[PDB]
């Protein structure tokens, strides 16, 4: 089960954007429906900056979404597996714009 993308990050940030909670809650409801599944949290970035820093930054966005569901959703940290894609695999053109915001995201997939 692949959950709706979570574009919750501003440029250079791994902390959640204002307005992010409503979307994290929607994802948390979907996780509560699949109790016991492996929760794979895959982080992404836009093209701006060095690709290796973007790889590191993508892992931190994945860890932040994981710790929100761990502490603000009461789910054991052992249920998650954090992943980072860096700037590879963009969903929209990275020439700044709203597309670059679409690339600063976290994809959650549930593995039975």
> Which experimental approach was used here?
X-ray
- The total number of structural domains in the chain stands at 1
Determine the 3-state secondary structure of 69 from DSSP: helix
Full domain range(s) for residue 19: 1-112
CB 83 within 8 A of CB 43: yes
The pair of structure tokens assigned to 103 is 């690339």
Determine the 3-state secondary structure of 80 from DSSP: strand
**Rounded-to-integer distance, Cα 102 and Cα 9, Å:** 9
**Rounded-to-integer distance, Cα 102 and Cα 76, Å:** 28
Residues 6+ apart with CB under 8 A from 4: 23, 26, 27
CB 91 within 8 A of CB 43: no
Resolution in A: 2.4
**Rounded-to-integer distance, Cα 16 and Cα 6, Å:** 10
Q: What b/e sequence results for 55-69 when a residue is b if at least 16 CB atoms lie within 10 Å of its CB, and e otherwise?
A: bebbbbbbbbbbebb
């Amino acid at each position: 089960v692949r959950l709706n993308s979570l574009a919750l990050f501003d440029a250079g940030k791994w902390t959640l954007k204002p307005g992010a909670t409503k979307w994290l809650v929607n994802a948390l409801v979907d996780i509560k429906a699949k109790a016991g599944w492996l929760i794979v949290v895959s982080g992404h970035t836009d093209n701006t900056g060095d690709p290796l820093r973007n790889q590191a930054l993508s892992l931190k966005r994945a860890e932040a979404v994981r710790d929100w569901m761990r502490d603000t959703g009461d789910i054991p940290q052992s249920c998650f597996a954090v992943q980072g894609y860096g700037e590879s695999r963009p969903v929209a053109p990275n020439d700044t714009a709203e597309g670059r915001a679409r690339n600063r995201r976290v994809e959650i997939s549930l593995v039975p």
